[PDB]
RNA sequence: GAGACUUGGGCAAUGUGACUGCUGAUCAGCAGUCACAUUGCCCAAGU
């Protein structure tokens, strides 16, 4: 969970500094899937929590 | 001697007025110097 949180900011900064529209979109998809992975992880953590 | 009057040498201040000089800080413009950040490229290694 902590590593995926770090990946959130890494993808955020790479998307912010990216220029090509294709690269922008690819970074956005990577960040979205990073959020989904985080959500599955934390939802599994919290139902047990 | 008593004195009045004037220029002096001044001693004082109560005013009041104006002049001159300097320091410091702030801002703006310009010039230059320190470090730091970002996107790259390439190389050196070790397993």
PDB file of C-alpha atoms (C1' of nucleotides) in Angstrom:
ATOM      1  CA  UNK A   1       0.000   0.000   0.000  1.00  0.00           C
ATOM      2  CA  UNK A   2       2.808   2.417   0.826  1.00  0.00           C
ATOM      3  CA  UNK A   3       4.633   1.536  -2.405  1.00  0.00           C
ATOM      4  CA  UNK A   4       1.464   2.046  -4.455  1.00  0.00           C
ATOM      5  CA  UNK A   5       1.013   5.417  -2.734  1.00  0.00           C
ATOM      6  CA  UNK A   6       4.531   6.319  -3.880  1.00  0.00           C
ATOM      7  CA  UNK A   7       3.660   5.152  -7.395  1.00  0.00           C
ATOM      8  CA  UNK A   8       0.702   7.550  -7.293  1.00  0.00           C
ATOM      9  CA  UNK A   9       2.965  10.576  -6.894  1.00  0.00           C
ATOM     10  CA  UNK A  10       5.507   9.226  -9.393  1.00  0.00           C
ATOM     11  CA  UNK A  11       2.822   8.835 -12.063  1.00  0.00           C
ATOM     12  CA  UNK A  12       1.324  12.208 -11.120  1.00  0.00           C
ATOM     13  CA  UNK A  13       4.610  14.041 -11.663  1.00  0.00           C
ATOM     14  CA  UNK A  14       5.416  12.114 -14.852  1.00  0.00           C
ATOM     15  CA  UNK A  15       1.965  12.944 -16.239  1.00  0.00           C
ATOM     16  CA  UNK A  16       2.390  16.593 -15.251  1.00  0.00           C
ATOM     17  CA  UNK A  17       5.746  16.843 -17.033  1.00  0.00           C
ATOM     18  CA  UNK A  18       4.793  14.742 -20.070  1.00  0.00           C
ATOM     19  CA  UNK A  19       4.180  16.517 -23.377  1.00  0.00           C
ATOM     20  CA  UNK A  20       3.076  14.049 -26.063  1.00  0.00           C
ATOM     21  CA  UNK A  21      -0.667  13.415 -25.916  1.00  0.00           C
ATOM     22  CA  UNK A  22      -0.143   9.664 -26.275  1.00  0.00           C
ATOM     23  CA  UNK A  23       2.311   9.712 -23.363  1.00  0.00           C
ATOM     24  CA  UNK A  24      -0.141  11.840 -21.366  1.00  0.00           C
ATOM     25  CA  UNK A  25      -2.915   9.309 -21.954  1.00  0.00           C
ATOM     26  CA  UNK A  26      -0.674   6.345 -21.135  1.00  0.00           C
ATOM     27  CA  UNK A  27       0.402   7.948 -17.852  1.00  0.00           C
ATOM     28  CA  UNK A  28      -3.237   8.697 -17.035  1.00  0.00           C
ATOM     29  CA  UNK A  29      -4.185   5.053 -17.617  1.00  0.00           C
ATOM     30  CA  UNK A  30      -1.271   3.882 -15.481  1.00  0.00           C
ATOM     31  CA  UNK A  31      -2.363   6.180 -12.652  1.00  0.00           C
ATOM     32  CA  UNK A  32      -5.991   5.043 -12.949  1.00  0.00           C
ATOM     33  CA  UNK A  33      -5.003   1.382 -12.732  1.00  0.00           C
ATOM     34  CA  UNK A  34      -2.700   2.250  -9.828  1.00  0.00           C
ATOM     35  CA  UNK A  35      -5.747   3.700  -8.056  1.00  0.00           C
ATOM     36  CA  UNK A  36      -7.792   0.577  -8.809  1.00  0.00           C
ATOM     37  CA  UNK A  37      -5.021  -1.672  -7.470  1.00  0.00           C
ATOM     38  CA  UNK A  38      -4.785   0.481  -4.346  1.00  0.00           C
ATOM     39  CA  UNK A  39      -8.560   0.248  -3.952  1.00  0.00           C
ATOM     40  CA  UNK A  40      -8.638  -3.538  -4.147  1.00  0.00           C
ATOM     41  CA  UNK A  41      -5.733  -3.741  -1.688  1.00  0.00           C
ATOM     42  CA  UNK A  42      -7.208  -1.327   0.858  1.00  0.00           C
ATOM     43  CA  UNK A  43     -10.733  -2.734   0.549  1.00  0.00           C
ATOM     44  CA  UNK A  44      -9.308  -6.172   1.319  1.00  0.00           C
ATOM     45  CA  UNK A  45      -7.424  -4.635   4.245  1.00  0.00           C
ATOM     46  CA  UNK A  46     -10.462  -2.801   5.647  1.00  0.00           C
ATOM     47  CA  UNK A  47     -13.037  -5.605   5.509  1.00  0.00           C
ATOM     48  CA  UNK A  48     -10.643  -7.543   7.723  1.00  0.00           C
ATOM     49  CA  UNK A  49     -10.116  -4.267   9.617  1.00  0.00           C
TER      50      UNK A  49
ATOM     51  C1'   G B   1      31.742 113.550  42.871  1.00  0.00           C
ATOM     52  C1'   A B   2      26.709 113.072  40.849  1.00  0.00           C
ATOM     53  C1'   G B   3      25.446 112.079  36.368  1.00  0.00           C
ATOM     54  C1'   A B   4      22.894 111.717  31.237  1.00  0.00           C
ATOM     55  C1'   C B   5      24.597 110.424  25.643  1.00  0.00           C
ATOM     56  C1'   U B   6      27.647 107.600  21.765  1.00  0.00           C
ATOM     57  C1'   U B   7      30.971 104.309  19.630  1.00  0.00           C
ATOM     58  C1'   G B   8      33.433 100.204  21.082  1.00  0.00           C
ATOM     59  C1'   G B   9      35.697  95.339  23.569  1.00  0.00           C
ATOM     60  C1'   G B  10      32.623  91.962  24.946  1.00  0.00           C
ATOM     61  C1'   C B  11      29.642  88.655  28.432  1.00  0.00           C
ATOM     62  C1'   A B  12      24.858  86.675  28.604  1.00  0.00           C
ATOM     63  C1'   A B  13      20.745  84.581  27.227  1.00  0.00           C
ATOM     64  C1'   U B  14      14.545  84.620  25.788  1.00  0.00           C
ATOM     65  C1'   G B  15      13.105  84.419  20.769  1.00  0.00           C
ATOM     66  C1'   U B  16      12.805  83.250  16.005  1.00  0.00           C
ATOM     67  C1'   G B  17      14.288  82.522  11.175  1.00  0.00           C
ATOM     68  C1'   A B  18      16.750  80.451   7.177  1.00  0.00           C
ATOM     69  C1'   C B  19      21.164  77.889   5.046  1.00  0.00           C
ATOM     70  C1'   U B  20      24.469  73.818   4.318  1.00  0.00           C
ATOM     71  C1'   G B  21      26.372  68.854   4.804  1.00  0.00           C
ATOM     72  C1'   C B  22      26.130  63.583   5.781  1.00  0.00           C
ATOM     73  C1'   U B  23      24.454  58.733   7.263  1.00  0.00           C
ATOM     74  C1'   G B  24      20.774  54.845   6.819  1.00  0.00           C
ATOM     75  C1'   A B  25      16.784  52.111   4.912  1.00  0.00           C
ATOM     76  C1'   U B  26      13.138  51.024   0.906  1.00  0.00           C
ATOM     77  C1'   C B  27      11.692  50.641  -4.230  1.00  0.00           C
ATOM     78  C1'   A B  28      12.644  50.478  -9.545  1.00  0.00           C
ATOM     79  C1'   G B  29      15.959  49.575 -13.711  1.00  0.00           C
ATOM     80  C1'   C B  30      20.423  47.300 -15.280  1.00  0.00           C
ATOM     81  C1'   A B  31      24.645  44.227 -14.736  1.00  0.00           C
ATOM     82  C1'   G B  32      27.035  40.187 -12.617  1.00  0.00           C
ATOM     83  C1'   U B  33      27.798  35.905  -9.020  1.00  0.00           C
ATOM     84  C1'   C B  34      26.464  31.802  -6.094  1.00  0.00           C
ATOM     85  C1'   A B  35      23.951  27.483  -5.172  1.00  0.00           C
ATOM     86  C1'   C B  36      19.311  24.376  -6.349  1.00  0.00           C
ATOM     87  C1'   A B  37      15.282  22.087  -9.358  1.00  0.00           C
ATOM     88  C1'   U B  38      13.239  19.694 -14.226  1.00  0.00           C
ATOM     89  C1'   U B  39      13.477  16.967 -19.008  1.00  0.00           C
ATOM     90  C1'   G B  40      17.369  14.204 -21.445  1.00  0.00           C
ATOM     91  C1'   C B  41      21.947  11.816 -23.441  1.00  0.00           C
ATOM     92  C1'   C B  42      26.221   8.965 -22.431  1.00  0.00           C
ATOM     93  C1'   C B  43      29.739   6.472 -19.500  1.00  0.00           C
ATOM     94  C1'   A B  44      31.918   4.005 -15.377  1.00  0.00           C
ATOM     95  C1'   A B  45      31.382  -0.066 -12.285  1.00  0.00           C
ATOM     96  C1'   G B  46      29.466  -4.383  -8.932  1.00  0.00           C
ATOM     97  C1'   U B  47      26.062  -8.916  -9.146  1.00  0.00           C
TER      98        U B  47
END
